Design an enzyme around this catalytic site. Structure first.
Site, PDB file in Angstrom:
ATOM      1  N   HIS A  94       0.889  -1.159   0.000  1.00  0.00           N
ATOM      2  CA  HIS A  94       0.000   0.000   0.000  1.00  0.00           C
ATOM      3  C   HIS A  94       0.927   1.209   0.000  1.00  0.00           C
ATOM      4  CE1 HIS A  94      -3.388  -2.592   1.243  1.00  0.00           C
ATOM      5  NE2 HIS A  94      -2.386  -3.293   1.745  1.00  0.00           N
ATOM      6  N   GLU A 104      -0.609   1.861   6.106  1.00  0.00           N
ATOM      7  CA  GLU A 104      -1.918   1.528   6.721  1.00  0.00           C
ATOM      8  C   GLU A 104      -1.820   1.611   8.253  1.00  0.00           C
ATOM      9  OE1 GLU A 104      -3.485  -2.046   4.576  1.00  0.00           O
ATOM     10  OE2 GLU A 104      -4.611  -0.392   3.647  1.00  0.00           O
ATOM     11  N   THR A 196      -7.381  -5.571   5.451  1.00  0.00           N
ATOM     12  CA  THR A 196      -7.562  -4.096   5.359  1.00  0.00           C
ATOM     13  C   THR A 196      -8.285  -3.691   4.078  1.00  0.00           C
ATOM     14  OG1 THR A 196      -5.514  -3.664   4.230  1.00  0.00           O
ATOM     15  CG2 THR A 196      -5.416  -3.788   6.691  1.00  0.00           C
TER      16      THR A 196
HETATM   17  C1  K45 Z   1      -8.617 -13.246  -2.152  1.00  0.00           C
HETATM   18  N1  K45 Z   1      -9.387 -11.999  -2.307  1.00  0.00           N
HETATM   19  C2  K45 Z   1      -8.744 -11.104  -3.277  1.00  0.00           C
HETATM   20  C3  K45 Z   1      -7.649 -10.293  -2.611  1.00  0.00           C
HETATM   21  N2  K45 Z   1      -7.820 -10.321  -1.156  1.00  0.00           N
HETATM   22  C4  K45 Z   1      -7.162 -10.913  -0.173  1.00  0.00           C
HETATM   23  O1  K45 Z   1      -6.888 -12.069  -0.199  1.00  0.00           O
HETATM   24  C5  K45 Z   1      -6.576 -10.062   0.925  1.00  0.00           C
HETATM   25  C6  K45 Z   1      -5.361 -10.471   1.505  1.00  0.00           C
HETATM   26  C7  K45 Z   1      -4.647  -9.621   2.330  1.00  0.00           C
HETATM   27  C8  K45 Z   1      -5.146  -8.358   2.610  1.00  0.00           C
HETATM   28  S1  K45 Z   1      -4.236  -7.296   3.676  1.00  0.00           S
HETATM   29  N3  K45 Z   1      -4.263  -5.833   3.048  1.00  0.00           N
HETATM   30  O2  K45 Z   1      -2.909  -7.876   3.776  1.00  0.00           O
HETATM   31  O3  K45 Z   1      -4.974  -7.201   4.913  1.00  0.00           O
HETATM   32  C9  K45 Z   1      -6.334  -7.946   2.045  1.00  0.00           C
HETATM   33  C10 K45 Z   1      -7.031  -8.787   1.196  1.00  0.00           C
HETATM   34  C11 K45 Z   1      -9.209 -10.010  -0.828  1.00  0.00           C
HETATM   35  C12 K45 Z   1     -10.064 -11.221  -1.168  1.00  0.00           C
HETATM   36  C13 K45 Z   1     -10.449 -12.045   0.069  1.00  0.00           C
HETATM   37  C14 K45 Z   1     -11.739 -12.816  -0.058  1.00  0.00           C
HETATM   38  C15 K45 Z   1     -12.157 -13.640   0.969  1.00  0.00           C
HETATM   39  C16 K45 Z   1     -13.380 -14.293   0.903  1.00  0.00           C
HETATM   40  C17 K45 Z   1     -14.196 -14.134  -0.194  1.00  0.00           C
HETATM   41  C18 K45 Z   1     -13.785 -13.334  -1.236  1.00  0.00           C
HETATM   42  C19 K45 Z   1     -12.565 -12.681  -1.175  1.00  0.00           C
HETATM   43 ZN    ZN Z   2      -2.390  -5.211   2.437  1.00  0.00          ZN
END
Ligand code: K45
Ligand code: ZN
Length: 258
Positions: A94, A104, A196
Site C-alpha cells: 500500500h 496503513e 484491510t
Molecule cells: C482473495 N481476495 C482477493 C484479494 N484479497 C485478499 O486475499 C486479501 C489479503 C490480504 C489483505 S491485507 N491488506 O494484507 O490485509 C487484504 C485482502 C481479498 C479477497 C479475500 C476474499 C475472501 C473471501 C471471499 C472473497 C474474497
Molecule cells: Zn495489504
C-alpha cells in the site's frame, strides 16, 4: 459501483457493502508505542523463505500481488504469537501519492511512505479460502517503507511494473526471493485484526516489524505510475491505496521487544 480508494467508493463507504467495516477487530490501527506492552512470553519469529517459489505478479486494480506456490510448505512463517505453520501465498504493498503518507498502520500517528504485507495462511485450514473464515486463519507480516537509500532486493519488482500497468495484467515473476525485502531486525508488534480491504474479514494475526526498510524515491515513484483502471480506460494513478487507522476497541498491542 465497486469498492476502491476514490471519493465515491473509498474506505468511508465500505461499510455499506461490508458492515464488518465497523466491527470489533478491524485493521489497520495506530500503534501507540508507549501503550504496547512487552510480552516476554512471545517467541522469536521464524521466517523460512529459503525454498520460496514466486510465480507471477498481478495488477488486481487495488494493488499488485507477487504470488507464490503455496501447494507445499516452501515459504512459511512460524513462532512469534503464532500456533502452527502459516504458508506464504502473496505479498503486496500500500503506498501514497506523497512520501508523507501511504502506510496503513501508523506508529505514534506517524505515516510511512508505504507498507509491505506478506500474507500467510494457517495450514490447519487446508486452503486460503477456508482460512479467511477463521479468527486465526491468516498471519500478515507488515513492514514499513521509508524513502531514502534504494532497497536492492526490491528493484526486480519495480522493473516489471511497466508490464502490469493496468488492472487485470499479469506477468511471469519466477525466482524472486522475498528475503531481500526484510529489515535486519525481526522485532515486532502483534495484535488481532482484519483484512484491510473488502471483505475486511476478521481473520488476521498482524505482525508489524518495528524496523522499516529504506527504498529510493525512484523506486516508490515507479509504484505511483501504476493504474487502478483497466487498459483503454481513463488513467487513474494507483496511489493512496491505504485504509486509515481504525478504532482499537477491546484490543492490546503486544511488543516482542523492550
Ligand atoms: C482473495 N481476495 C482477493 C484479494 N484479497 C485478499 O486475499 C486479501 C489479503 C490480504 C489483505 S491485507 N491488506 O494484507 O490485509 C487484504 C485482502 C481479498 C479477497 C479475500 C476474499 C475472501 C473471501 C471471499 C472473497 C474474497
Ligand atoms: Zn495489504
Amino acid at each position: 459501483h465497486h469498492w476502491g480508494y476514490g471519493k465515491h467508493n473509498g474506505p468511508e463507504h465500505w461499510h455499506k457493502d461490508f458492515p464488518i467495516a465497523k466491527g470489533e477487530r478491524q485493521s489497520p490501527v495506530d500503534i501507540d508505542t508507549h501503550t504496547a506492552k512487552y510480552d516476554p512470553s512471545l517467541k522469536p519469529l521464524s521466517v523460512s523463505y529459503d525454498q520460496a517459489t514466486s510465480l507471477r505478479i498481478l495488477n488486481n486494480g487495488h494493488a499488485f500481488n507477487v504470488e507464490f506456490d503455496d501447494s507445499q510448505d516452501k515459504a512459511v512463517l512460524k513462532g512469534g504469537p503464532l500456533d502452527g505453520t502459516y504458508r506464504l501465498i502473496q505479498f503486496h504493498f500500500h503506498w501514497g501519492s506523497l512520501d508523507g503518507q501511504g502506510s496503513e498502520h501508523t506508529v505514534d500517528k506517524k505515516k510511512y511512505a508505504a507498507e509491505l504485507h506478506l500474507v500467510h495462511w494457517n495450514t490447519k485450514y487446508g486452503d486460503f479460502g477456508k482460512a479467511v473464515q477463521q479468527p486465526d486463519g491468516l498471519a500478515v507480516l507488515g513492514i514499513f517503507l521509508k524513502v531514502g537509500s534504494a532497497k536492492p532486493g526490491l528493484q526486480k519488482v519495480v522493473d516489471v511494473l511497466d508490464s502490469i500497468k493496468t488492472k487485470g495484467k499479469s506477468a511471469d515473476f519466477t525466482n524472486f526471493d522475498p528475503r531481500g525485502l526484510l529489515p535486519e531486525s525481526l522485532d515486532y508488534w502483534t495484535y488481532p485484526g482484519s483484512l484491510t480491504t473488502p471483505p475486511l474479514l476478521e481473520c488476521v494475526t498482524w505482525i508489524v516489524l518495528k524496523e522499516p526498510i529504506s527504498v529510493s524515491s525512484e523506486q516508490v515513484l515507479k509504484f505511483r505510475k501504476l493504474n487502478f483502471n483497466g487498459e483503454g480506460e481513463p488513467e487513474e494513478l494507483m496511489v493512496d491505496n491505504w485504509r486509515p487507522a481504525q478504532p482499537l476497541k477491546n484490543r492490546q498491542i503486544k511488543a516482542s521487544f523492550k
